[PDB]
Write a protein that binds this ligand. Structure first.
Ligand SMILES: Nc1ncnc2c1ncn2[C@@H]1O[C@H](COP(=O)(O)OP(=O)(O)OP(=O)(O)O)[C@@H](O)[C@H]1O
Ligand SMILES: Nc1ncnc2c1ncn2[C@@H]1O[C@H](COP(=O)(O)OP(=O)(O)OP(=O)(O)O)[C@@H](O)[C@H]1O
Ligand SMILES: Nc1ncnc2c1ncn2[C@@H]1O[C@H](COP(=O)(O)OP(=O)(O)OP(=O)(O)O)[C@@H](O)[C@H]1O
Ligand SMILES: Nc1ncnc2c1ncn2[C@@H]1O[C@H](COP(=O)(O)OP(=O)(O)OP(=O)(O)O)[C@@H](O)[C@H]1O
Ligand SMILES: Nc1ncnc2c1ncn2[C@@H]1O[C@H](COP(=O)(O)OP(=O)(O)OP(=O)(O)O)[C@@H](O)[C@H]1O
Ligand SMILES: Nc1ncnc2c1ncn2[C@@H]1O[C@H](COP(=O)(O)OP(=O)(O)OP(=O)(O)O)[C@@H](O)[C@H]1O
Ligand SMILES: [Cl-]
Ligand SMILES: [Cl-]
Ligand SMILES: [Cl-]
Ligand SMILES: [Cl-]
Ligand SMILES: [Cl-]
Ligand SMILES: [Cl-]
Ligand SMILES: [Mg+2]
Ligand SMILES: [Mg+2]
Ligand SMILES: [Mg+2]
Ligand SMILES: [Mg+2]
Ligand SMILES: [Mg+2]
Ligand SMILES: [Mg+2]
Lengths: 225, 225, 228, 227, 226, 225
């Protein structure tokens, strides 16, 4: 029957989303630079491992595994240990148009590590890396559709350049994803404020509009209203 | 005589449209992501079947039949049963420029299932999937023309980026369709509000402007004013 | 002769007041609007009234909508276009699908001579350039058509598409400049409600009222309220 | 001495321009559709003929001479009589590597033949669009303007624009090549239109600034100088 | 400190804390009729009259004759200065893009007339005359860099379309120039107001923001504020 | 967590909670005349004078001599520092791949034992060779190699609006670890300078815009609480 959700245990998120992220579906998490997209994607995996012993695969296209690990120490998280224990796997897909080969490497890692959670950060970059903007819808669809067939629950980050403009970069990514989460970092009166919005969850309910959040030493904390 | 309408049974819609959707004509349903387009197009067919034993054909370019069926369980509708009974046919037109082949597959399904209601979701995506943005007016016209000839009553969804900008994506879709419905999901003061507007019905009358609506466990509910 | 230009009554309620007597004879009038503003309705009412009131035959040129659907939609208003086609008073010319309008223009001309038409509606010209990806040549080919119609002496309503209520008059930024006369139909959304207005922006060589005038579309077609 | 001006006798305009249009120079008159560009350019020639016996050449790329003549009857002007007397020439440059050289020599032939002091060219936008030559607008508008200055014609050239408060002309270069720039506006506010005329620039001389209201009536253009 | 040369344009030397940086390029950008040509002429004229510093004026469209005629509006006699060899007007109007030939022509004139000041009016136009927009940064950089090597002090005018939009036309010109002056002619409430701003002078100080100015029979007059 | 090196630019080390993250790249973006070059020169000069940390300055347009002359504006003697081998000005102006440039930078960093690197401006070198299609690829290659080398890098970039895109090509901020935005906002005919740390990966900083002034003593930023 109806879609089930997995608790993210990210403070306030499971309230906003009426239970967590839809299982076996993809969630687009989109935001301007420094909005906390990587943090959200890491905290998803980390909580999966710590709260439910669900292994996670982190796919990176630019940042090195070592820097992902190093930056997570800002939040007191020891990702190197989780890697050593085989609970976390960071797949380095950085450079040295068709996503089929990558998709197969990712599927391979999911199977190998028995992963229930996957984060991909950021899919925007791989198309720009290889001047492939003409084929974004088709290739993103290929990736999302395969992850659905595998039954992976996935967070995929993407980039945007305006807080109240396009949801992502090419005006197609939100339509391909099952779920859309928008992180904003709005500048008004010389000051910033962070908000999180669940725009869409296909096949299930969620709270609407923007909710304040903070990034602290404990990662993301969202305040439902 | 003046053009006849078929009831959608979508609460409030047949009020706003003065009796329903014009029979044998095409209706564009456009909106940003997560506005309720797929829901509207599913509810149209589902109601046709349950209320009038009127079979329907659902054309998908991306979402699988399985996920379409799963997401509809959010509302307590059992679409698998209807597929099993031959009352609903979900035509999978996802990938493995001319719409003739697609058109013939749709016609075949209309004649085979004896269907009078057709939903096509989303016609935007198919142009993007084959980079055929330059031929949109010509090919959307071919599609709509042929469905008019066949006598189908058709809901076609399309994608947009702004709540008050272009009706659809390419600036031509609204002019090729006989009828235009716009779903909006406006963000103001950090909160969303859903509205539906019937912009146009050729050859007949309708209520004007935006009417609020909600998506609940019973599908779309529009409040006429 | 040596008088200023004469006008032909549309008999569209209020329009002949706004236009100080109707549409200038032998000239082209652009009627431009977002989707659902009443462009087809205007262009139909122009021919229909010309036939019913003045026995002036009309030619309607369509590039997408079928004759049968044009006829059917006009019954919304209790008009019987089928009857008029039967009597040879209305001809609906189906023009549905380098780039050159010369052939089309000759077919239109042939139709005008054959039916002895005084009034012509072309709906919509926008679409034919989009149907063949011919935006580069719009000014030249639209001029070819308008100039030939003027030469013939036809009184023509040409509809065109726009996508903003207060942006460009038409789609390509040239159409208003090629036509002799320009009418803009708006359907403005404000505070969740729509309102319809009609503006005569320009009539070359003659006077008209200025600004937007409200109008409704009812069972009798377009009804415009002059203000003053 | 500084540049001299010829009177347009368009009511109000010679006050706003501190004397009239600079002699031997090109004046761009730009505006959205129906702002009065053709009317300004006709009235400029008509007044030249009637008040000063200064013959005029009118260059058209789309409107026929017969329609130009017919539309001027709206204002009670008999342009056919002036054509018959050899005082007005309407040069039909309608259609039937883009280069305006031949056009320029047809214009010069007319100027020399009619001993014309005044020239109106309407609209210069249209000829670039007719031949899909937008890429070359600055070079060929400059050729035209330079050649007319060489000939010493005082020229009104009309151009099209899409916004009341946006670009001066169409391609963002026309106002830079012209010596003088006048902007006709027809602003819609509160469902009502108002007409205003602005002299943006006259090279080498002075003029009033900002927008001045005007009306188009049976007597042509009438401009109200505020102060 | 880079040193400055007085423009002697009333108020400008106050706004710029002494004048234009010597041996460097100053971009002067504005919509049509803002006073760009006037500024660049007044710069050369004053250099001659006040300091006997010879000037070269490079035009791509306007003839020398019309430049001279239009300056009579301000009671300046440029013809006399051309005669005396203090002012050279270099007519570069027309009959892969590469400014090298023009640079050599400009360089020749600077040596011959021994010019210390140079005005180029307008560099926008030359790129559009030869549909060469794709290469503006590279070629404007070539021009600025060589003028600097020669040690010329240069005013280069450029065109813009909006009073509060891009500084120039191609979004690169301000970054190539050492110094940037924006002339505005803002329309508000049906009335125009002229203002001058010095956006940037590399390596030295200047006043900030917009200062009102007028164009009169005496040329540009800028009103410094406070 | 990541460590930080003090810039000693007055106010900045407060705003950044300690300085620039060591071994990472910091984008400094701004419209013309915002103080980008000045910031990147003060970074190296303070490094040399206060900590005896050698610096490499990379220029694509401004000559070494003018960089030196312009720094005299602030009482800094850069020619002396170049003479002592404390500062190396790498002239990369002209006479698509950034590999050559990168090997020259690395060589200069080894040779002069530099801890600090400023590159001014990264924008311009892509415009100089019309290589805008390749910005994200090539900026990534430069940033990645400098992270490997462990240099602490300031990279300036150009923008054309105060409240528009962070940089010029919509990708530079996503590739950099850290992002600083200098603004020069015109309002009511007056300019005001502000600095904003938009983002520091892996660590904390103050948010929003802070006023600053450029004086005879360089940049001076006022933190606000
Ligand atoms: N311990 C901490 N306390 C407070 N804020 C922190 C801490 N650690 C990191 N941050 C904040 O988190 C932000 C970094 O977030 P993250 O890398 O997840 O963003 P992003 O959206 O992925 O950026 P980019 O788009 O450039 O990849 C930093 O900019 C910093 O403001
Ligand atoms: N049982 C329910 N109760 C309330 N809301 C629900 C329920 N089920 C789904 N929804 C809402 O319906 C919205 C999604 O609807 P739908 O899939 O029709 O949107 P769409 O316009 O087709 O999206 P896209 O354009 O991305 O395809 C979800 O975003 C969720 O907010
Ligand atoms: N009997 C009626 N009473 C009231 N309004 C009606 C009636 N019949 C039609 N309409 C209105 O007339 C509008 C259709 O007008 P029309 O087809 O002339 O518009 P259009 O501008 O030509 O549309 P498009 O640009 O998409 O071709 C309908 O959208 C409907 O609101
Ligand atoms: N006798 C008159 N009284 C009042 N107004 C008139 C009269 N005759 C013409 N007009 C007005 O003159 C207006 C402007 O005419 P004109 O042809 O000069 O415009 P234009 O700017 O050249 O238009 P386009 O750019 O489309 O060529 C007409 O739209 C009409 O409003
Ligand atoms: N004697 C004068 N008194 C007042 N203003 C004058 C005088 N002479 C010229 N002007 C003004 O100077 C302006 C001409 O300025 P100038 O030619 O320097 O402008 P520009 O910015 O170079 O124009 P463009 O971009 O067309 O080249 C004229 O538009 C006019 O307003
Ligand atoms: N001694 C000083 N006192 C005050 N301001 C100064 C001083 N020296 C330089 N400036 C200011 O510093 C600004 C120059 O800064 P800088 O060269 O660092 O800018 P930038 O952002 O690199 O410019 P561009 O992007 O066009 O290269 C000058 O525009 C000037 O306003
Ligand atoms: Cl925070
Ligand atoms: Cl809802
Ligand atoms: Cl109505
Ligand atoms: Cl009027
Ligand atoms: Cl002034
Ligand atoms: Cl300051
Ligand atoms: Mg990130
Ligand atoms: Mg959908
Ligand atoms: Mg229509
Ligand atoms: Mg005209
Ligand atoms: Mg000038
Ligand atoms: Mg700099």
């Amino acid at each position: 029957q109806a879609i089930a959700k997995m608790r993210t245990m990210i403070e306030g998120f499971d309230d906003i989303s009426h239970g967590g992220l839809p299982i076996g579906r993809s969630t687009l998490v989109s935001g301007t630079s420094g909005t906390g997209k990587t943090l959200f994607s890491i905290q998803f995996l980390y909580n999966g491992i710590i709260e439910f012993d669900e292994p996670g695969v982190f796919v990176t296209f630019e940042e090195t595994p070592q820097d992902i690990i190093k930056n997570a120490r800002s939040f007191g998280w020891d990702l190197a240990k989780l890697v050593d224990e085989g609970k976390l796997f960071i797949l380095d897909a950085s450079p040295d148009f068709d996503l089929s080969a990558l998709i197969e490497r990712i599927n391979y890692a999911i199977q190998k590590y028995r992963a229930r959670r996957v984060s991909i950060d950021s899919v925007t970059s791989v198309f720009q890396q290889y001047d492939a903007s003409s084929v974004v819808r088709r290739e993103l669809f290929r990736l999302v559709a395969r992850l659905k067939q595998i039954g992976a629950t996935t967070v995929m980050t993407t980039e945007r350049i305006e807080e109240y403009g396009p949801i992502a970069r090419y005006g197609v990514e939100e339509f391909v994803s099952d779920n859309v989460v928008i992180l904003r970092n709005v500048l008004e009166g010389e000051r910033r404020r962070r908000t999180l919005e669940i725009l869409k969850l296909r096949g299930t309910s969620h709270m609407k509009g923007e909710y304040p959040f903070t990034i602290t030493d404990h990662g993301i904390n969202i305040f439902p209203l």
